[PDB]
From a paper:
Beside the cysteine-protease activity, facilitating cleavage of the viral polypeptide chain, PLpro has the additional and vital function of removing ubiquitin and ISG15 (Interferon-stimulated gene 15) from host-cell proteins to support coronaviruses in evading the host’s innate immune responses. PLpro is required to recognize and cleave the motif LXGG within preprocessed polyproteins between nsp1/2, nsp2/3 and nsp3/4 into functional units for initiation, replication, and transcription of the viral genome. PLpro folds with a right-handed architecture consisting of thumb, palm, and fingers domains with a catalytic triad consisting of Cys111-His272-Asp286 and a N-terminal ubiquitin-like domain. Four cysteine side chains coordinate a zinc ion, constituting a ‘zinc finger motif’ that is essential for structural stability and protease activity of the enzyme.
HE9 binds at the surface of PLpro adjacent to the binding cavity with ligands HBA and YRL. The interaction to PLpro is formed by hydrogen bonds of the dihydroxyphenol edge to the side chain of Glu 70. The calculated binding energy for this interaction is −6.15 kcal/mol. We determined the binding constants for the ligands HBA and HE9 using their quenching effect on the fluorescence for PLpro applying the nanoDSF (nano Differential Scanning Fluorimetry) method. This resulted in Kd values of ~400 μM for HBA and 1 mM for HE9 (depending on the emission wavelength used). In particular the two compounds, HBA and YRL significantly decreased PLpro activity by ~73 and 70% respecitively, followed by HE9 inhibiting to ~55% in a deISGylation assay; while the inhibition was not as pronounced applying Ub-Rhodamine as substrate. Further, we determined the inhibition efficacy by performing in vitro IC50 assays, which demonstrated efficient inhibition of the three compounds namely HE9 (methyl 3,4-dihydroxybenzoate), HBA (p-hydroxybenzaldehyde) and YRL (4-(2-hydroxyethyl)phenol), in a concentration range of 3.76 ± 1.13, 3.99 ± 1.33 and 6.68 ± 1.20 μM respectively. The compound HE9 significantly reduced viral RNA (vRNA) replication among the three compounds studied and was further evaluated to determine the effective concentrations that can reduce not only vRNA levels but also SARS-CoV-2 virus infectious particles applying a cytopathic effect (CPE) inhibition assay. Importantly, treatment of the cells with the compound HE9 reduced the viral replication and showed an ability to inhibit CPE with IC50 = 10 µM. These results from the cellular assays are in line with the in vitro enzymatic studies using deISGlyation assays and clearly demonstrate that the compound HE9 is a potential inhibitor of PLpro, which can protect the host cells from the viral CPE. Thus, the compound HE9 could indirectly attenuate the viral activity by reversing the host deubiquitination events linked to the IFN response deficiency in Vero cells.
Numbering used by the authors:
A (entry chain AAA), B (entry chain AAA): 1 to 315
The structure:
């Protein structure tokens, strides 16, 4: 006696594909790797409660490969299995509202993700992949499980792995529309003279070497090929924010001089991030935890600043 | 009795750091994770033959974090351990010269890497990270082990994993200077009218949906939000190449009409890439293998074309 149920398959959870499945065969025998809201059901036979439900599958025909690429903007063949694996964990995380922002309760070394998510909610940024658009909208409303699982997938991080905020923001910026952003730098060597550089997109809003946007505008010392120290300074900036990053160092954050920042305590093998936001006072958001202070000093690794248009007065 | 040797530590294999190591303690007890030309020596005690040798370590102080970021352009904390793990394998791969290009002898599902490397040698592209500049220069001369291990690290792929050429090229392009590249598209819906789009950088040279650069210039059918099919066509192109990608489909490559292409045989779970180059005839490079033909038809997934400046005659 042959028994079947109707189910839907999908890659994007919007475009459904009708399937009739034999209840005597695993999902894996019929579709390949199959997932039900993050749970791997590849080795499970259909249940009556599955009738009418949506399962994710891998893009195993041309229709699904086009739907997957258009939604996620990747053709990495392990992407959907990494997104599903992460989602099976992130759907059980808690996303409390802390000082008006979606945060994440600490679990599975997710501190870098909490500070990234809190940061995104304070800067002007629009994603390009529909998957990130749709999930980020949900995350802002407080249901951030899909958004967090997609960040893990896009970054090639598994739940529990130690992440870097700067690296995470770089991946998210690579999937954002930053095409309007432009940076002009000048590098002055007393031996080699001057060299100007123009940067665009992600490389226009990120700098690694100093936390201070004012110091970047006055000049920072860097090696020259000739062996002297050259001075690099900001000639021109067009962007709605900038991100200044550095290896973690004791640094003073003053109310009203920055938007938000990331603090890292620990070492290269394990540590903990916290988020500092400058509002009516300085709030320190640590997952679900919140404290406040008029002054802040800590091992800061990233600082975000508001921008629109800057032009140097250095001739 | 306390015995020591001098060794050097590094993150970039250029900047050396003098160390004195106790021969009674593992490298791991003294430096953390340590590698000798890709081999993990973390759990090994120093040998006399190690005196004067360079070991890679993880960026565990501010000097190393700056050297690592400046050389690799990443702050992913697992990067160097992934680069070292891959290199331990790639240094044993063979890199034959095939029709004047560095290829790779098949091993560990590396076909996607061989076709990517052959492609890079046929298109005008300069990398931004010194690590890729230096390794790509070595790869062009025939010593591609570092370059292949860095592609694996930057792509978050391990040796043996099934890769996608389009995805791999996207990661390499993200680390290349494509800031001059510009694409203007027009999307025409008989219901919604016209919408023009400008793309920059990587998104100016990559398109997913059609293999044909001529079809892209005449127009390709895509969904509109209103439910009709719209026509997307190329208004303007400034770049030294373009890459046209699609799910694998039988396709005819004609001598003199393209630069090179990737062919994929198999399915979403496992397959094999080959490279087709258009020179004095059509050469099919399959790792170490070479064949030739006047005509070619196969399941093509990517085609590369030469460009400088294009302007449509569609009004
Ligand atoms: C990275 O991939 C893309 O940028 C991309 C792919 C498909 C689209 O429809 C689109 O608007 C952008
Ligand atoms: C992605 O990171 C960068 O683009 C970057 C980082 C350091 C540099 O000295 C540089 O010229 C570029
Ligand atoms: Cl968005
Ligand atoms: Cl280069
Ligand atoms: Zn100089
Ligand atoms: Zn329309």
């Amino acid at each position: 006696e042959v028994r079947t149920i109707k189910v839907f398959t999908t890659v994007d959870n919007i475009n459904l594909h009708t399937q009739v499945v034999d209840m005597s065969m695993t999902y894996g025998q019929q579709f390949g790797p199959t997932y039900l809201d993050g749970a791997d059901v590849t080795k499970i036979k259909p249940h009556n409660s599955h009738e009418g439900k949506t399962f994710y599958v891998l893009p195993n025909d041309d229709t699904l490969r086009v739907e997957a690429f258009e939604y996620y903007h990747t053709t990495d063949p392990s992407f959907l299995g990494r997104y599903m694996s992460a989602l099976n964990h992130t759907k059980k995380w808690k996303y409390p509202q802390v000082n008006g922002l979606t945060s994440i309760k600490w679990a599975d070394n997710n501190c870098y993700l909490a500070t990234a998510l809190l940061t995104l909610q304070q800067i002007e940024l629009k994603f390009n992949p529909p998957a990130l658009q749709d999930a980020y909208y949900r995350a802002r409303a407080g249901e951030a499980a899909n958004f967090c699982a997609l960040i893990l997938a896009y970054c090639n991080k598994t739940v529990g792995e130690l992440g870097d905020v700067r690296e995470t923001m770089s991946y998210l910026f690579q999937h954002a529309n930053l095409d309007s952003c432009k940076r002009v730098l000048n590098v002055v060597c007393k031996t080699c003279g001057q060299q100007q550089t123009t940067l665009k997109g992600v490389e226009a809003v990120m700098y690694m070497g100093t936390l201070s946007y004012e110091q970047f505008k006055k000049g920072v010392q860097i090696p020259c090929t000739c062996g002297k120290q050259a001075t690099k300074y900001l000639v021109q900036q067009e962007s709605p924010f900038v991100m200044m990053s550095a290896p973690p160092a004791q640094y003073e954050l003053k109310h009203g001089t920055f938007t938000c920042a990331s603090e890292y305590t620990g070492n290269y093998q394990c540590g903990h991030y916290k988020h500092i936001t400058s509002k009516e006072t300085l709030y320190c958001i640590d997952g679900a935890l919140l404290t406040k202070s008029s002054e802040y000093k800590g091992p800061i690794t990233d600082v975000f600043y508001k921008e629109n248009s800057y032009t140097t007065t250095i001739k």
